[PDB]
Amino acid sequence: MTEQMTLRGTLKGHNGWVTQIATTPQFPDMILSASRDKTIIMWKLTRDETNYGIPQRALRGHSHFVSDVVISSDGQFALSGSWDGTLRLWDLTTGTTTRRFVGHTKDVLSVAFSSDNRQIVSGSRDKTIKLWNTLGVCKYTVQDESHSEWVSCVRFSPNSSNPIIVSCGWDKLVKVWNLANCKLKTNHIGHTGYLNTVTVSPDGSLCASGGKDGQAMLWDLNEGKHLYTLDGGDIINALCFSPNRYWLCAATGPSIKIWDLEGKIIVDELKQEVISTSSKAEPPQCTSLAWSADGQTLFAGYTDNLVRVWQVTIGTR
């Protein structure tokens, strides 16, 4: 009865690459997905035979590609970043921009919400990390010891006891910052390509990074030491930890590889149903991943404007 994943359905409605997917534990029937169509679609998970989900609302305030989107712990707000250089705080009840965050001079590539939602962190192509409050005021700007190339991903650690921020960039470095003084804490070297994503486990003890070099390295956040490297075999566009199982999911090229962290083995490889077409074009690239609240559903965004839904089905041998 090894666990397997099956395609339950796709979410249609986006007009550009689905860049990020966000889920909230409070609302199992609602997810958000950013896109290159400059909008964020709030979905209604009807789970009907005709459609798994339909678009319910669109957040239309960004003038360029939306890069990142995160939902609040309460689930009523959504922070978002864009290539317009600004962040937007959305009230999900009315779909309006409550607040705007200005100060980045280049495209914003990643935004994160603190565990207690009282802090906001963003990375931008201007090579800097900015820390904001909920009122739109940039309290601190990290330029000393910052990445020398684009900051592609910034994340918070879910563990409040360890207040750290993980940051990757195109300078092939993973940096851990102490949130107490906004100072560099650890500097992880070992990637031979630019980094695209970093994810932190639900217990705030392990970090996974990946990107151009195709290797998903795991770094201990408690001890600041390299642990293992998993061969993705393709450019890693997104990384995710299962909220309940010891799994690491990577959006490597057009497919998603799931790894059992205990055995360092591939549990499943989620390839799209490639039609027997004569087209020589590369299949759509998986660029985003998100696990549901209960960890039984995985949402993946692709470059064909779709959000494919994968279900954890107990597969009898």
Binding site: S72, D74, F77, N117, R118, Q119, L131, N133, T134, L135, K139, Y140, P163, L179, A180, N181, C182, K183
Partner: peptide
Amino acid sequence: ASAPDVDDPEAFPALA
């Protein structure tokens, strides 16, 4: 500028 005080509630107001 010094790093902002995280514990400071007025410096970092709650989200509501």
